[PDB]
Design a protein around this ligand. Sequence first.
Ligand SMILES: O=C(CO)[C@@H](O)[C@H](O)[C@H](O)COP(=O)(O)O
Ligand SMILES: O=C(CO)[C@@H](O)[C@H](O)[C@H](O)COP(=O)(O)O
Ligand SMILES: [Mn+2]
Ligand SMILES: [Mn+2]
Lengths: 190, 190
Amino acid sequence: MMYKEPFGVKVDFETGIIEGAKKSVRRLSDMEGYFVDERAWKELVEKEDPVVYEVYAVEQEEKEGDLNFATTVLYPGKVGKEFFFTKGHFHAKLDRAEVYVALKGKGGMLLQTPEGDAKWISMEPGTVVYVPVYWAHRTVNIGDEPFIFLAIYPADAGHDYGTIAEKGFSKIVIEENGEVKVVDNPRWKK
Amino acid sequence: MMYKEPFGVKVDFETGIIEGAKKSVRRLSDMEGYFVDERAWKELVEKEDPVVYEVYAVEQEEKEGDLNFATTVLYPGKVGKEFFFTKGHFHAKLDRAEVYVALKGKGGMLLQTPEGDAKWISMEPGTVVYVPVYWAHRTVNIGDEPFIFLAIYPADAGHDYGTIAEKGFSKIVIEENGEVKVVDNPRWKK
Ligand SMILES: O=C(CO)[C@@H](O)[C@H](O)[C@H](O)COP(=O)(O)O
Ligand SMILES: O=C(CO)[C@@H](O)[C@H](O)[C@H](O)COP(=O)(O)O
Ligand SMILES: [Mn+2]
Ligand SMILES: [Mn+2]
């Protein structure tokens, strides 16, 4: 038995950056078919193709009992009425929980069961969200500034994007009459 | 099946307090046989029996894939030359990692393998520490203010305090001549 070396890394709570982490960038062009308003999506991709979110991940070999962590910086914006959000996923191993820690900004988490039953959890700095086993989860930025959070998750959880990519979430988070509303997705399969 | 409800809880990054969490308090009298200077321990217990640390825990039923989280508020102080620390433990399931996030104050983590090989990791706010499988871990407050951190750990990791209670750590963290030092534990056997 060799032992893995313990380590510390600095996370800047204001920027979300973790030095030496695997950085990933999701631009709007990378999210075709995720937003309700396809015409608003095409127009925004043409004009700007803005970054929707960036992820800084510190990941281990996929093995039972080990833990990954990542920050996400979710930028503010709307595609039509719909606030910017992360793609969303179930874990590849469904029976894996996750803990989120909100660091900066205003947002929330949309969760749904495999049957499409939905839950909205508000997130402000200091909110810790527990994502239980079997729940798909997507984060949403509802404010004017970046929404930054840290996720800690089992190293073997994986990501299943496919199911969400096709069917989506049963709820959408929109601005309507200057109010943030969590409403039925008109294009929800079921 | 019955799904576990997702939930959000507020963590105050300034105080470590989690709303509605299971609170535990460890006083100096709860830590007989932990500190090198037994006479200093006895004198301080008699004079004050200070609170050494408090823990606010949000725990799930012990099952693979699930996650617990907890804040600790580690108070400043010394027993003789030795800084206040947590009892320290291995996980009962040794193959379980943990992630710590430092929130306030100045401190660090002492880690040790089953063979007694040791490592110190400095923690200042924003430091995330990865505790690998098979490492015992103890946090230490090396400053004049509370050292506050959040730990996220597998719900089935459990706690093995007994090994540490009997053998201690191979290194100790002290103040000598106004300098903070990590040095060999004189009472360590090996
Ligand atoms: O939930 C996790 C990991 O299990 C987060 O680290 C997300 O992966 C990240 O916020 C990006 O979101 P997705 O693009 O993966 O939905
Ligand atoms: O590592 C963990 C849990 O696995 C921390 O939440 C500690 O339990 C806490 O800092 C108190 O310290 P101990 O008294 O448990 O050493
Ligand atoms: Mn996830
Ligand atoms: Mn632990």
